[PDB]
Design a protein around this ligand. Structure first.
Ligand code: PLP
Ligand code: PLP
Ligand code: 4TB
Ligand code: 4TB
Lengths: 394, 388
């Protein structure tokens, strides 16, 4: 029977890593990495996190089944970290998921459960996993203009025009901050306008928030999300803890469902818990317990925020440098967007041909769409990348 | 939009604990003499070693770590592990392994039906209902003898067709406590082979019946006869890591070509569901299994738990015979695993919970691990008073 299985395409990350590994070039560089890497090229375990695991090891007396939709401490701490004082517990449903991806999958299952004729609107471009899951679910997908290949910024007028075609009950997927893969983001004023279009169309916003604390700051990065929450009656937020906590493999995230009434909330929580139940019963405990420990323990929380800010500040300075080196070599602004972008990713606007030429002539590797990971740059690699970008004629 | 949501039915077994002198004989978790579910020594030691050895937490394998996958395959199939034709997938507990098993089978056969035992773990039917899969049942429990109705089981299983999936509990049958012998397993293998039915084995209590190796005996027999088989394994109970959510799906194929197919489709299933599987619990399992000293202590601790429960069952049967002189409740001693279904009806069950304060699943399923020297006489009395 299993022989009738259709061949499924690999993870691709492997192919990139295999091509790169095969490269005999002593000076090859890898900007395709999708995780944070420090100056030495490592993805360290944050101090606060290692401190939480030591504490957990000393306090946990059992490992019996716990909360089906997560532990109260985690749900509460997450909603506060995301919505801040605006957290309206009375109308908020929460679900511990298996990473932000689990949160996205559940959110989609929830919405479709409420509206079978659900349509999803995704940005152009967006994280490929978005489309993958949606295709796998057989949901209709529409695209809305977003990245401007010429300016490397947001084509807002285009986005508005396309979003204007959403109907009541449709879903609009928005990256809360640090757009992956582009790095081009919305201003708080652009968020206000998007909010108006959403109220007008009656479309349901789904926010993919996986990089809170990597853009302009913990609070600053949630500004757009908070604006949507306060003006839109129903909002779905899929949050991740893999990156801003550095616990990728622990698989920790959560689905937040903001509802109009308390009755509607009771409904949503019941459907979410039911969803977890029908997929894998209980969500993973370890990673979520680390997070709630860091956030509830003053000492740890303070250390986490400090370490996270150090990371953010570092990448931002890497942006300033690359843009400066590019300013000098080009003798023009052109590449100024590099310093204007936020997140650990940036789309250079290079064509596939140029990307291939950069790799062959300079040994630098990046995703085929010209996406580079800022964290992979340093005092030694920046001059090389700059020269390569200019040399290939981007 | 969310207002359209219809209310969903609660998990009965988990709701049971909601209504919780008080004697909990519900949820299938192991508990010691003082009513606690401890962390196993080896497990704790593994975590400490893990705390010192792990330097990063970056994304890892989409199908789980090679070490975990290998340790699990060896634990389950032993020397009958033909890696060349076996696909492995780390999952979110045994339930996760189950869900992925049904999804995989459905991709291969959009026209599949599932045969489940009467009775079976309620979560089996709920998941199948949710997926919209046709469910047929096969006789298994003999209501009067509290044993297996084997003739009835064979008759029903023979009605299966090529492409159908037969769900068999590998050992310690939840919720009955009744289990097939190795001679019955061979006969089942005969029926399956003839019909071309794909068996899905739910293995959640390996180590709680007669022993680690002995409890995998049936699964190994089917794996050696049937060319294609699916096994969903849970490490929740035998490792005492319930909340970590760790298990795995094994897809045994007739050849490496099909194996590469299943392996690819299995990984894809994780990617499109939650991306990567949870690492912590799987790391503990592989650490314990590949560290001779740890494996040794875990086997010993599990062994102790095993024999302990076995003794409790004997106490139950005994005390109960002192209250009748009849071998009516003898089945308690025969049943193997954590559970045992008494012949009590719902009314009787209620009388017990209300006028005796002892909470058991509404079908007479009791978790023997909940009993002890102090409560056995009380429970023995309870079911005698209520007359069952
Ligand atoms: C990382 C990421 C996620 C979620 O990652 P998880 O590893 O599942 O926590 C979701 N959306 C985007 C855009 C991401 O970059
Ligand atoms: C425990 C159990 C499972 C799976 O449990 P998980 O906590 O999801 O690992 C599956 N089937 C049966 C019969 C079980 O008792
Ligand atoms: O590089 C990125 O887009 C972030 C990596 C996140 C993930 C990749 C595959 C599954 S989750
Ligand atoms: O008690 C049982 O039947 C199994 C353990 C409890 C569980 C219910 C759902 C997933 S695990």
């Amino acid at each position: 029977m299993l022989g009738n299985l259709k061949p499924q395409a690999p993870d691709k990350i492997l192919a990139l890593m295999g091509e790169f590994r095969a490269d005999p070039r002593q000076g090859k560089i890898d900007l395709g990495v999708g995780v944070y890497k420090d100056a030495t090229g490592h993805t360290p375990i944050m101090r606060a996190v290692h401190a939480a695991e030591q504490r957990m090891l000393e306090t946990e007396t059992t490992k019996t089944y716990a909360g089906l939709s997560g532990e109260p401490e985690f749900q509460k701490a997450m909603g506060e970290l995301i919505l801040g004082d605006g957290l309206k517990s009375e109308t908020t449903a929460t679900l511990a998921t298996v990473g932000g991806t689990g949160a996205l999958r559940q959110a989609l299952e929830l919405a479709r459960m409420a509206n079978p004729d659900l349509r999803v609107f995704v940005s152009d471009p967006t994280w490929p996993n978005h489309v993958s899951i949606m295709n796998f679910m057989g949901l209709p997908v529409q695209t809305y203009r977003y990245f401007d290949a010429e300016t490397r910024g947001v084509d807002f007028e285009g986005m508005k025009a396309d979003l204007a075609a959403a109907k009541k009950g449709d879903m609009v997927l928005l990256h809360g901050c640090c757009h992956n893969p582009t790095g081009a983001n919305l201003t708080l004023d652009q968020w206000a306008e998007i909010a108006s279009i959403l109220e007008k169309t009656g479309a349901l916003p789904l926010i993919d928030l996986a990089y809170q604390g990597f853009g302009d700051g913990l609070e600053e990065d949630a500004a757009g999300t908070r604006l949507i929450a306060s003006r839109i009656p129903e909002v779905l937020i899929a949050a991740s803890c893999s990156k801003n906590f550095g616990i990728y493999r622990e698989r920790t995230g959560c689905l937040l469902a903001l509802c109009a009434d308390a009755a509607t909330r009771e409904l949503a929580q019941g459907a979410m818990a039911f969803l977890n139940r029908q997929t894998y019963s209980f969500p993973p405990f370890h990673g979520a317990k680390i997070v709630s420990t860091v956030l509830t323990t003053p000492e740890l929380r303070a250390d986490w925020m400090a370490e996270l800010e150090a990371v953010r500040s570092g990448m931002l300075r890497l942006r300033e440098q690359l843009a400066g080196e590019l300013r000098d070599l080009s003798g023009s602004d052109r590449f100024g967007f590099v310093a204007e972008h936020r997140g650990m990713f940036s789309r250079l606007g290079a064509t596939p041909e140029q990307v291939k030429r950069i790799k062959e002539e300079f040994g630098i590797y990046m995703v085929g769409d010209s996406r580079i990971n800022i964290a992979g740059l340093n005092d030694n690699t920046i001059p090389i990348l700059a020269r390569a970008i200019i040399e290939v004629g981007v």
